[PDB]
């Protein structure tokens, strides 16, 4: 608000995730490893309140590596045969400070035969003294 005496920092929590599992029988183009990525907020905290859209920059070896998510649970499901750093972007709803955050999530896949991959990690964005519109959405989250 515009009546600030104590500096308030509102923190939003975004979560990077991905699973990986191998099919013993690759696809036509020989892609063996199937995975799925996650960008969202913690359980009960909805990012769709302060978050607008989302984008994934997979590797160029992947058809249309940039996957955009303008909907609920933001994710990507693809198949390949290697891991890599995947620069993920979450778009924020603001006219103020950066309207995007880029999370370089490490896409690791497990060896053929026994792949258990289910990883989720949580990032923190603290906004010191944000405008009401921003504060307001961050609170609704």
């Amino acid at each position: 608000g515009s009546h600030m005496a104590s500096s308030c920092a509102v923190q939003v929590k975004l979560e990077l995730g991905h699973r990986a599992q191998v099919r013993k029988k690759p696809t036509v183009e020989g892609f063996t490893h199937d995975w799925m990525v996650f960008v969202r907020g913690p359980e009960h905290s909805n990012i769709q309140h302060f978050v607008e859209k989302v984008v994934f920059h997979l590797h160029e070896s992947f058809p249309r590596p940039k996957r955009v998510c303008k909907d609920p649970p933001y994710k990507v499901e693809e198949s390949g045969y290697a891991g890599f750093i995947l620069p993920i972007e979450v778009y924020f709803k603001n006219k103020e400070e950066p309207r995007k955050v880029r999370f370089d999530y490490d896409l690791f896949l497990h060896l053929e035969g026994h792949p258990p991959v289910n990883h989720l990690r949580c990032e923190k964005l603290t906004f010191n003294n944000p405008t009401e519109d921003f504060r307001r959405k961050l609170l609704k989250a």
């Binding site: 990986a20 191998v22 490893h33 590797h59 160029e60 070896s61 045969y81 290697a82 891991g83 890599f84 750093i85 690791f108 896949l109 497990h110 060896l111 053929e112 026994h114 792949p115």
Partner: peptide
């Protein structure tokens, strides 16, 4: 750590 191969055709620099 049974981590599968990784494509290093790109550059992180």
């Amino acid at each position: 750590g049974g981590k599968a191969p990784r494509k290093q055709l790109a550059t992180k620099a």
